[PDB]
Amino acid sequence: GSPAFGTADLSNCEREEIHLAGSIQPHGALLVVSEPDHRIIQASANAAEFLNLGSVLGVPLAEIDGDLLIKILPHLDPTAEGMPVAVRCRIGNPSTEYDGLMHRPPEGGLIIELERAGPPIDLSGTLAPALERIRTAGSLRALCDDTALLFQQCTGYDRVMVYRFDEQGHGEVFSERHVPGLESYFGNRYPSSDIPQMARRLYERQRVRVLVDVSYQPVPLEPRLSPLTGRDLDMSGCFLRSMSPIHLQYLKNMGVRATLVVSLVVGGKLWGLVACHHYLPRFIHFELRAICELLAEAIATRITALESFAQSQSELFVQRLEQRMIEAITREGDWRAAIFDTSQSILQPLHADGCALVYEDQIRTIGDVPSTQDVREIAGWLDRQPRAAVTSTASLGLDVPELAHLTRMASGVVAAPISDHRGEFLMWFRPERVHTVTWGGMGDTPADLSPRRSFAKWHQVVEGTSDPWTAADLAAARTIGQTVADIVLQF
Ligand SMILES: */C=C/C1=C(C)C(=O)N/C1=C\C1=NC(=C\c2[nH]c(/C=C3/NC(=O)C(C=C)=C3C)c(C)c2CCC(=O)O)/C(CCC(=O)O)=C1C
């Protein structure tokens, strides 16, 4: 079934227990405390040297040099806003300050992650004109480009990419900003398997993820197995959680040495990431984490506003076309001209590269459409049996093997009937998605992991396929198809 944390290979890593890592990155320390009463019962092995403490494991938090207990207590107030929560405390014998991050896993007590504090700095001069740029963005393109720039300006990382996941989970490098001279990944695709489902749920549970040095030596928890459960400690909510050797090897092959990844979550779904990559090990100021979180919420809000604006654009193009015909039939005794271009493109309310109208044995086409004999082959298949108000597919060959030769122009077809005579259709097209990008290639083993190979593994799945048809896509064909039909019954 599911391989334990350090132990997967390329064939079973989907199910690797990355949330049960059993270890942390060396630049912090992790205590596990029981409740109530707050006895340290599990600790990262580096805890004593890291925190300047004699012993750790088994000693009550009250008895640890320096105010940590006192600093967590106000956040266990039933009525407080509570966990996850950050605190600043002093710990240890040569006493020093730490930023603590406390949360409660569903099982195992209280987890407290510690890192060395620096002096307090105020980053709020950053989020305000950034907030204005985000809320001001005119399009998804513009917003993601500005978000790559913005994240590069406030993080200083060598490369920032904003990925965007599609219906199936696959990633597109949708925006990129990098220091001149690096190679570009802008426009690359990767298969959804490059990011395991559990990694995806982890990006929803915490919104900032940090790797300071791709070369670190994991520091194990002791005892490892939680004494309260006899099982591995749920580490979903741990900022210091080690990172899978699989992905570390991926970064090593890419040249990359550090990583600051921020989650974009839209309507409760992981929508993409803002990935910051550095070609050097890289520490960050604690106050940079809240900045990322605030920024990613603004972005996610804007994306919602854009998708929603796009929505009513469609619903407009529609009820603003019942009229492109109403009259444009008064003089010029036929409606078709309204269908085809006129810059009210029948092609974009569905994001298609081609459209055809088959009506009374007359076939007209804009964009990239199969041969007119080929439209007829499709019309012949639509008439083979009774259909829904809309019929669609994003893998025409394979769904309909005899139509395989149409993969090029028409892996994706959506058809809507326009009467009952039938043989009469409004038909939209999309090419095999391979033709929406090109570049790629190669083989398999952790040493072979790379963007190049990922772009190739992507072309391989996806093979007999177009961009999938969305709900909105189908709603549009639905309602467009309908109002044409309504108005053909007219005359
Ligand atoms: C079977 C397991 C894995 C295979 C195979 C794999 O490629 N990755 C697997 C596990 C993990 N991936 C994690 C994060 C991650 N992986 C990549 C993959 C990309 N593919 C691309 O072509 C490129 C470059 C353009 C990349 C970066 C991406 C994009 C991500 C998101 C993180 C990032 O951008 O740095 C992952 C989680 C790591 C963690 O612990 O935070 C696991 C596990």
Mention every residue, 6+ apart, whose C-beta is less than 8 A from residue 69: 38, 61, 62
Experimental technique, in short, is: X-ray
By DSSP bridging, strand 96-103 and strand 269-278 are: unpaired
Buried b (16+ CB within 10 A) or exposed e, 116-152: ebeeeeeeeebbeebeebbeebeebeebbbbbbebbb
Number of H helices, E strands in the chain: 14, 18
- DSSP-derived secondary structure letter, 241: B
Q: Per the structure block, which two tokens stand in for 260?
A: 């600051």
Cα–Cα dist 78/131, whole Å? 33
Judge contact between 60 and 38, C-beta under 8 A: yes
Q: Per the structure block, which two tokens stand in for 87?
A: 């605190």
Cα–Cα dist 29/100, whole Å? 10
Ligand 1 atom 21, closest CA: 451
Which conformational region is residue 331 in: left (phi greater than 0), alpha (psi within -120 to 50 degrees), or beta? Answer: left
One-letter amino acid of 364: R
Q: Alpha-carbon torsion 266, 267, 271, 273, what sign?
A: positive
Question: Shortest CA distance to 186 belongs to which of 467, 463, 451?
Answer: 451
Spell out the long-range contacts of 336-343 with Cβ–Cβ below 8 A and sequence spacing 24 or more: 336/364, 339/364, 339/426, 339/484, 340/364, 340/366, 341/366
- φ/ψ (deg, to 5) at 395: -165, 70
Q: Per the structure block, which two tokens stand in for 101?
A: 């991050």
List the 85-91 sheet strands across, edge first: 23-24, 219-222, 40-44, 29-33, 110-116, 96-103, 85-91
Q: Is 199 in the pocket of ligand 1 (CB under 6 A)?
A: yes
Judge contact between 288 and 210, C-beta under 8 A: no
Q: Which helix (H) or strand (E) holds 142?
A: helix 140-155
Question: Shortest CA distance to 84 belongs to which of 113, 107, 64, 124?
Answer: 113
Mention every residue, 6+ apart, whose C-beta is less than 8 A from residue 331: none
- Which atom number of ligand 1 is nearest to the Cα of residue 185? 25
Judge contact between 248 and 5, C-beta under 8 A: no
One-letter amino acid of 295: L
- Which atom number of ligand 1 is nearest to the Cα of residue 171? 29
Cα(85) to ligand 1 centroid in Å equals 28
- DSSP-derived secondary structure letter, 10: T
Residue whose token pair is 């409004």: 426
User: Quick check: bond before 36 cis, omega within 30?
Assistant: yes
**Three-state DSSP state, 444:** coil
CB 186: neighbour CB atoms within 10 A?
14
One-letter amino acid of 61: L
List the 425-430 sheet strands across, edge first: 362-367, 354-359, 425-430, 412-417, 391-393
Judge contact between 53 and 64, C-beta under 8 A: yes
Q: Is 235 in the pocket of ligand 1 (CB under 6 A)?
A: no
Which conformational region is residue 126 in: left (phi greater than 0), alpha (psi within -120 to 50 degrees), or beta? Answer: alpha
Q: Is 454 in the pocket of ligand 1 (CB under 6 A)?
A: yes
- DSSP-derived secondary structure letter, 38: -
Ligand 1 atom 37, closest CA: 199
Q: Is 275 in the pocket of ligand 1 (CB under 6 A)?
A: yes
Cα(182) to ligand 1 centroid in Å equals 19
Judge contact between 349 and 314, C-beta under 8 A: yes
Judge contact between 24 and 242, C-beta under 8 A: yes
- Which atom number of ligand 1 is nearest to the Cα of residue 14? 1
Residue whose token pair is 């994001």: 351
How many residues in total does the chain contain? 491
Question: Shortest CA distance to 239 belongs to which of 214, 271, 265, 261?
Answer: 261
Q: Is 258 in the pocket of ligand 1 (CB under 6 A)?
A: no
Strands (E), 7-144: 23-24, 29-33, 40-44, 85-91, 96-103, 110-116
Cα(195) to ligand 1 centroid in Å equals 5
**Three-state DSSP state, 230:** coil
**How many angstroms separate the most distant Cα atoms in the chain?**
94
Mention every residue, 6+ apart, whose C-beta is less than 8 A from residue 163: 171, 172, 173, 174, 272, 273, 275
Mention every residue, 6+ apart, whose C-beta is less than 8 A from residue 279: 158, 159, 182, 255, 256, 257
Cα–Cα dist 258/215, whole Å? 9
Q: Alpha-carbon torsion 75, 77, 81, 84, what sign?
A: positive
**Three-state DSSP state, 75:** helix
- φ/ψ (deg, to 5) at 412: -120, 125
Classify residue 475 as exposed, middle or buried by CB count within 10 Å of its CB (0-12, 13-18, 19+).
middle
Q: Is 195 in the pocket of ligand 1 (CB under 6 A)?
A: yes
Q: Is 241 in the pocket of ligand 1 (CB under 6 A)?
A: no
**Three-state DSSP state, 412:** strand
Domain extents in the chain: 1-28+121-307, 29-120, 308-491
